[PDB]
Enzyme design. Structure first.
Site, PDB file in Angstrom:
ATOM      1  N   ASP A   1       0.790  -1.254   0.000  1.00 33.74           N
ATOM      2  CA  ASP A   1       0.000   0.000   0.000  1.00 33.74           C
ATOM      3  C   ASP A   1       0.801   1.273   0.000  1.00 33.74           C
ATOM      4  O   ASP A   1       0.706   2.073   0.926  1.00 33.74           O
ATOM      5  CB  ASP A   1      -1.198   0.065   0.980  1.00 33.74           C
ATOM      6  CG  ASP A   1      -2.295   1.093   0.575  1.00 33.74           C
ATOM      7  OD1 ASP A   1      -2.299   1.559  -0.622  1.00 33.74           O
ATOM      8  OD2 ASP A   1      -3.124   1.471   1.460  1.00 33.74           O
TER       9      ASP A   1
ATOM     10  N   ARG B   1      -1.146   8.513   1.754  1.00 32.04           N
ATOM     11  CA  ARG B   1      -1.810   8.328   3.067  1.00 32.04           C
ATOM     12  C   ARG B   1      -0.924   7.599   4.088  1.00 32.04           C
ATOM     13  O   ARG B   1      -1.165   7.713   5.284  1.00 32.04           O
ATOM     14  CB  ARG B   1      -3.162   7.585   2.945  1.00 32.04           C
ATOM     15  CG  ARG B   1      -3.026   6.161   2.480  1.00 32.04           C
ATOM     16  CD  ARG B   1      -4.340   5.379   2.491  1.00 32.04           C
ATOM     17  NE  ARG B   1      -4.192   4.338   1.484  1.00 32.04           N
ATOM     18  CZ  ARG B   1      -4.504   4.495   0.213  1.00 32.04           C
ATOM     19  NH1 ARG B   1      -5.005   5.646  -0.219  1.00 32.04           N
ATOM     20  NH2 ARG B   1      -4.223   3.557  -0.655  1.00 32.04           N
ATOM     21  N   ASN B   2       0.062   6.824   3.602  1.00 30.57           N
ATOM     22  CA  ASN B   2       0.950   6.016   4.421  1.00 30.57           C
ATOM     23  C   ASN B   2       2.333   6.623   4.553  1.00 30.57           C
ATOM     24  O   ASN B   2       3.259   5.945   4.971  1.00 30.57           O
ATOM     25  CB  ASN B   2       0.990   4.578   3.890  1.00 30.57           C
ATOM     26  CG  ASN B   2      -0.364   3.927   3.993  1.00 30.57           C
ATOM     27  OD1 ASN B   2      -1.095   4.210   4.917  1.00 30.57           O
ATOM     28  ND2 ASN B   2      -0.759   3.120   3.019  1.00 30.57           N
TER      29      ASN B   2
ATOM     30  N   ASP C   1       4.070   3.043   9.796  1.00 29.49           N
ATOM     31  CA  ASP C   1       4.013   1.646  10.242  1.00 29.49           C
ATOM     32  C   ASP C   1       3.331   0.776   9.191  1.00 29.49           C
ATOM     33  O   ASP C   1       2.302   1.187   8.625  1.00 29.49           O
ATOM     34  CB  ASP C   1       3.231   1.549  11.563  1.00 29.49           C
ATOM     35  CG  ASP C   1       3.132   0.131  12.032  1.00 29.49           C
ATOM     36  OD1 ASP C   1       4.175  -0.446  12.374  1.00 29.49           O
ATOM     37  OD2 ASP C   1       2.037  -0.433  11.972  1.00 29.49           O
TER      38      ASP C   1
HETATM   39  C1  LIG Z   1      -1.021   7.470   8.625  1.00 28.84           C
HETATM   40  N1  LIG Z   1      -0.683   6.341   9.484  1.00 28.84           N
HETATM   41  C2  LIG Z   1      -1.510   6.040  10.557  1.00 28.84           C
HETATM   42  N2  LIG Z   1      -2.476   5.168  10.350  1.00 28.84           N
HETATM   43  C3  LIG Z   1      -3.317   4.822  11.298  1.00 28.84           C
HETATM   44  C4  LIG Z   1      -3.218   5.366  12.557  1.00 28.84           C
HETATM   45  C5  LIG Z   1      -2.221   6.291  12.820  1.00 28.84           C
HETATM   46  C6  LIG Z   1      -1.350   6.641  11.807  1.00 28.84           C
HETATM   47  C7  LIG Z   1      -0.256   7.649  12.083  1.00 28.84           C
HETATM   48  N3  LIG Z   1       0.890   6.946  12.663  1.00 28.84           N
HETATM   49  C8  LIG Z   1       2.023   7.700  12.929  1.00 28.84           C
HETATM   50  C9  LIG Z   1       3.262   7.037  13.027  1.00 28.84           C
HETATM   51  C10 LIG Z   1       3.369   5.626  12.851  1.00 28.84           C
HETATM   52  N4  LIG Z   1       3.464   4.512  12.714  1.00 28.84           N
HETATM   53  C11 LIG Z   1       4.418   7.765  13.298  1.00 28.84           C
HETATM   54  N5  LIG Z   1       4.385   9.053  13.462  1.00 28.84           N
HETATM   55  C12 LIG Z   1       3.259   9.737  13.389  1.00 28.84           C
HETATM   56  N6  LIG Z   1       3.018  11.065  13.529  1.00 28.84           N
HETATM   57  C13 LIG Z   1       1.691  11.328  13.368  1.00 28.84           C
HETATM   58  C14 LIG Z   1       1.123  12.687  13.465  1.00 28.84           C
HETATM   59  C15 LIG Z   1       1.882  13.706  14.045  1.00 28.84           C
HETATM   60  C16 LIG Z   1       1.369  14.979  14.142  1.00 28.84           C
HETATM   61  C17 LIG Z   1       0.106  15.250  13.659  1.00 28.84           C
HETATM   62  C18 LIG Z   1      -0.649  14.248  13.082  1.00 28.84           C
HETATM   63  C19 LIG Z   1      -0.149  12.970  12.980  1.00 28.84           C
HETATM   64  C20 LIG Z   1       1.032  10.168  13.114  1.00 28.84           C
HETATM   65  C21 LIG Z   1       2.033   9.099  13.120  1.00 28.84           C
HETATM   66  S1  LIG Z   1       0.638   5.408   9.140  1.00 28.84           S
HETATM   67  C22 LIG Z   1       1.771   6.513   8.272  1.00 28.84           C
HETATM   68  O1  LIG Z   1       1.143   5.022  10.385  1.00 28.84           O
HETATM   69  O2  LIG Z   1       0.133   4.439   8.257  1.00 28.84           O
END
Ligand SMILES: CN(c1ncccc1CNc1c(C#N)cnc2[nH]c(-c3ccccc3)cc12)S(C)(=O)=O
Ligand SMILES: CN(c1ncccc1CNc1c(C#N)cnc2[nH]c(-c3ccccc3)cc12)S(C)(=O)=O
Lengths: 271, 258
Positions: free
Chosen positions: A131, A135-136, A149
């Site tokens: 993916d 968004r990721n 992650d």
């Molecule tokens: C979009 N993603 C997510 N998907 C589902 C739930 C939460 C997230 C955000 N995860 C993270 C990670 C991980 N792993 C590391 N740093 C992070 N920083 C932030 C963040 C910081 C400031 C403001 C808003 C978000 C989120 C975040 S991902 C990229 O992990 O797939």
């Protein structure tokens, strides 16, 4: 070993949701105040759920790259938590939206380049991401992006199995062999990276706006492809169109993509 | 890529392929008045299907351009149909390693494994799966140069095959890495074949039980660790050719320094 004591973690606000439960921001007292992302697991008292959840930390533990979020550690006692590095500037799509007038072209090419280095690294370990989409991707600093992650990145793919999920299958990003035969390979990851590069050059605008997911495959199989974004260098758009070769064997590998993106970045920084 | 026949002097037969004898010869052209060439012949090329299959072997080679892969020079479409390839003057690698067994230095053996990894990283970059990586398919151009031979001439080799290839007939870039590991072992063994004395039917059982080819005498331990990574049962745990090439370059530097 990467086991962490709970007392050393201050659980802060919920910043999102994953397949296993809420993801929180927090502080890890190791420096004495490191900002972290904390994955929680609502059904982890079930051994099979706990095993699936902790496997996501084992997956991230095998990787070590400047452009991939690092696993900090795990708390294997209930409630079971996975501690990840926090990218302080948040989601890439929101970051690009805020700067749709501010950010320079060289910065957009830099993010595509940094992502190609992370993906060449994953390709070297024979890991298929499945993916690759804006968004990721997270933002660590103005000059640094990271893949988030991997378990959390499968949220859209997994949405078909969760009745309460807000997600939808990521059809608009998927290679035709992935949509048609559920084949996920290093070549289908290259197709998705092409779409991710298009999103970045489009300042976080989603591909195929207004098109229903069910209508995507027919468009792709009829030879339709995403158009050249305004201000995209033609050499970079030619690279994206190579990523979208219908025949997966005709798509480039990440080593070539990284080398070509480095050249495109140099030519842009020179003008 | 069409060549005139009289511009070829057909020499001695140097081997046989599926379509017929392979000869060495001389190609006279304005670019080189006496280029040494390998000539693939086709005894049944009056048959349309045989002719099409034979000329497809030239088309396959025509798409590649690498210093460590034999080049296609051209084709003679008129009967008898011939395929003109670059000649590797020193012949087959296994015979070469056997002759120079006591002569060749360790640095030369590592160099051949390195040069082959560059050709295989190039094939990997084009998403081409070879399926037949073995010392039998390597030729010697000079004391300091080896090349992968003609892919058509290169066409069960159970003792070289990855377990997923034996079990499920899956041939991928990862199964090519497994075969390259066996090829490196053959080179360090001076052209000795893998699993001597073991019946083909018994190989998979041994492999499944965790058995692997032993460290060759005089093989640097870092190089043997690289071969054992090529033989990871799980194909996803095997390295790619970019890592193999970088690691072989380091191993070669350390050996040339001594
Ligand atoms: C979009 N993603 C997510 N998907 C589902 C739930 C939460 C997230 C955000 N995860 C993270 C990670 C991980 N792993 C590391 N740093 C992070 N920083 C932030 C963040 C910081 C400031 C403001 C808003 C978000 C989120 C975040 S991902 C990229 O992990 O797939
Ligand atoms: C082993 N291979 C063969 N298999 C069947 C028939 C013939 C060969 C050798 N073919 C070649 C090629 C090709 N293609 C180039 N140079 C060559 N030089 C020689 C040679 C030179 C001197 C003495 C003996 C052989 C053979 C030869 S391969 C690697 O092509 O699959």
């Amino acid at each position: 070993d990467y086991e962490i004591q709970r007392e050393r973690i201050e659980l802060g606000r919920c910043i999102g949701e994953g397949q296993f439960g809420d993801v929180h921001q927090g502080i890890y007292m190791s420096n004495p105040a490191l900002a972290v992302a904390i994955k929680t697991c609502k059904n982890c008292t079930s051994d099979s759920v706990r095993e699936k959840f902790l496997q996501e930390a084992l997956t991230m533990r095998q990787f070590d790259h400047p452009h991939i979020v690092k696993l900090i550690g795990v708390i294997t006692e209930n409630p079971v938590w996975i501690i990840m590095e926090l990218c302080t500037l948040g989601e890439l799509r929101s970051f690009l939206q805020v700067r749709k007038y501010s950010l320079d072209l060289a910065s957009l090419i830099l993010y595509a380049y940094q992502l190609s280095t992370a993906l060449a690294y994953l390709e070297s370990k024979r890991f298929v991401h499945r993916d690759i989409a804006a968004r990721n991707v997270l933002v660590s600093s103005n000059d640094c992006v990271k893949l988030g992650d991997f378990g959390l990145s499968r949220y859209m793919e997994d949405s078909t199995y969760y009745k309460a999920s807000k997600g939808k299958l990521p059809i608009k990003w998927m290679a035709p062999e992935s949509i048609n035969f559920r084949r996920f390979t290093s070549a289908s990851d290259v197709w998705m990276f092409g779409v991710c590069m298009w999103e970045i050059l489009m300042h976080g605008v989603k591909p195929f706006q207004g098109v229903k997911n069910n209508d995507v495959i027919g468009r792709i199989e009829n030879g339709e492809r995403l158009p050249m974004p305004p201000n995209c260098p033609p050499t970079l758009y030619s690279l994206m169109t190579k990523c979208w070769a219908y025949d997966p064997s005709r798509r480039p590998r990440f080593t070539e993509l990284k080398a070509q993106l480095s050249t495109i970045l140099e030519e842009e920084k020179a003008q």
